[PDB]
Design an enzyme around this catalytic site. Sequence first.
Site, PDB file in Angstrom:
ATOM      1  N   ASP A  94     -29.126 -75.754   0.712  1.00 40.79           N
ATOM      2  CA  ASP A  94     -29.784 -73.820   0.944  1.00 40.79           C
ATOM      3  C   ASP A  94     -30.137 -73.361   0.256  1.00 40.79           C
ATOM      4  O   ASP A  94     -29.564 -72.204  -0.213  1.00 40.79           O
ATOM      5  CB  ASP A  94     -27.653 -73.846   1.065  1.00 40.79           C
ATOM      6  CG  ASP A  94     -27.193 -74.954   1.494  1.00 40.79           C
ATOM      7  OD1 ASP A  94     -26.850 -75.127   2.551  1.00 40.79           O
ATOM      8  OD2 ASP A  94     -25.243 -74.710   1.172  1.00 40.79           O
ATOM      9  N   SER A 119     -32.954 -68.843  -2.797  1.00 35.01           N
ATOM     10  CA  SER A 119     -31.129 -69.790  -3.253  1.00 35.01           C
ATOM     11  C   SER A 119     -30.327 -68.199  -1.524  1.00 35.01           C
ATOM     12  O   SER A 119     -30.017 -66.853  -2.057  1.00 35.01           O
ATOM     13  CB  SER A 119     -30.684 -69.043  -4.158  1.00 35.01           C
ATOM     14  OG  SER A 119     -28.798 -69.323  -3.710  1.00 35.01           O
ATOM     15  N   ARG A 120     -30.699 -69.378  -0.641  1.00 33.78           N
ATOM     16  CA  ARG A 120     -30.220 -68.234   0.556  1.00 33.78           C
ATOM     17  C   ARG A 120     -29.046 -68.241   0.802  1.00 33.78           C
ATOM     18  O   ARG A 120     -28.926 -66.873   1.390  1.00 33.78           O
ATOM     19  CB  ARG A 120     -30.223 -69.797   1.402  1.00 33.78           C
ATOM     20  CG  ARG A 120     -31.943 -70.342   2.437  1.00 33.78           C
ATOM     21  CD  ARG A 120     -31.594 -71.785   3.871  1.00 33.78           C
ATOM     22  NE  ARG A 120     -31.351 -71.386   4.219  1.00 33.78           N
ATOM     23  CZ  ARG A 120     -32.611 -70.458   4.948  1.00 33.78           C
ATOM     24  NH1 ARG A 120     -33.025 -70.542   4.856  1.00 33.78           N
ATOM     25  NH2 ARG A 120     -31.973 -69.482   6.506  1.00 33.78           N
ATOM     26  N   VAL A 121     -27.873 -68.309  -0.542  1.00 36.86           N
ATOM     27  CA  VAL A 121     -26.363 -67.708  -0.310  1.00 36.86           C
ATOM     28  C   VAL A 121     -27.366 -66.513  -1.061  1.00 36.86           C
ATOM     29  O   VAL A 121     -26.245 -65.247  -0.715  1.00 36.86           O
ATOM     30  CB  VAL A 121     -26.016 -68.896  -1.153  1.00 36.86           C
ATOM     31  CG1 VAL A 121     -24.750 -67.564  -1.943  1.00 36.86           C
ATOM     32  CG2 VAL A 121     -25.585 -69.854  -0.770  1.00 36.86           C
ATOM     33  N   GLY A 122     -27.956 -66.086  -2.157  1.00 38.08           N
ATOM     34  CA  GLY A 122     -28.423 -65.177  -2.304  1.00 38.08           C
ATOM     35  C   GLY A 122     -27.527 -64.761  -3.536  1.00 38.08           C
ATOM     36  O   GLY A 122     -26.594 -65.114  -4.603  1.00 38.08           O
TER      37      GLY A 122
END
Lengths: 128, 46, 268
Positions: A94, A119-122
Amino acid sequence: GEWFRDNGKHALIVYDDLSKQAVAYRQLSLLLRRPPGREAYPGDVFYLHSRLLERAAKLSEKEGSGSLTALPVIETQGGDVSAYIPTNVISITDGQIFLEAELFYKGIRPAINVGLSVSRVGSAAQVK
Amino acid sequence: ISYAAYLNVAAQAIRSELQTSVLNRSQTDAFYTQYKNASEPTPITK
Amino acid sequence: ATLKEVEMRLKSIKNIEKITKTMKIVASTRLSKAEKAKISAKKMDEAEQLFYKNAETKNLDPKELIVAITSDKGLCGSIHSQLAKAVRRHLNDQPNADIVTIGDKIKMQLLRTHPNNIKLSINGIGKDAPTFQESALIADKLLSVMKAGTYPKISIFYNDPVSSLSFEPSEKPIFNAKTIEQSPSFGKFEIDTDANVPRDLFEYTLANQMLTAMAQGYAAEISARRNAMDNASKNAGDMINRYSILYNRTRQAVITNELVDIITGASS
């Protein structure tokens, strides 16, 4: 690291080096005489890292909110992310922290490339 | 006002069909910009 | 190494090869105006300086105004390099001076070596052939916002095209109203002491000598840009063809390696 996830504790696992794991698995398959795929790698080399990384996750509150953080490490040749294995693991994780060698000797350490790393989560999992 | 200006005006009058180069000298794009100890005041045109 | 990276890298050089060659023509076909405006200026220069010669005008016996003459456009060679040093080197002797810079690529070296000396700078001029209106206005500001008439010494720094393959940093003096009428052989010429001739003569020779400096300055440049980009197109050759071979060395290796996996996985 799953025991910690299964028991309301937090574990962080680092796979280093993963590129070498696939190398090994290619050895098994080729000697067992299973048909080769791309770059000689076995046909199910994507499944090799899919079932592995998916195991790392944040459980629910009913299960104990235990988590498992995975930091896979892959090695590229000539800065070629467009390679077979690199692309596989990339489409799994992710995120991605791409370290360039040019930025390394130029002074920036760690040599993180802001343009290719995300960072897809962010901010979802960051300090307010 | 300058003497070079008293002459410039006249040179503009002689722009009076077949005026080829001639049109390249008819106008120009100029921006002057003062300076201080370098810092610099607002850039205006000529 | 990449299937594509060596092709798109060959593209950003294959079109760079033509672009430097296309500007070489622009600089070479614009040399015609350069070798003309150069002779026209010089001929008017003789007509303008003959009075200053027969009158024997020279600087009086710590202010001095320095004017830098170049363009904002790069890709022309060491024309902005050697001229800026000629100024800096002349500035060393008399640090007490103000510098007006025409063009930004001359404002570069001067902002570094002597940042405070620059009291005025002209922007976006060096692209065409100079004109009187352009210079006459530069002198109008030089006279107004700078008060050049209050200076004991004026010096214009420009580039002089000695040869068609080499330039030459040079310097010319401009004399103020007071320096003109106080010339040794000034009485030699009959002049009505009332119509402020010496005053009008300076404000007029201030604009012309600039254009004359610009004409040769932007002529030595165009003659240097052609040179600068003839070596560029040739240098773009040892790239378009060098990496061209490297593209094929990669194409043949791509088709073979792409075919090996097929043959290997077909033996079962």
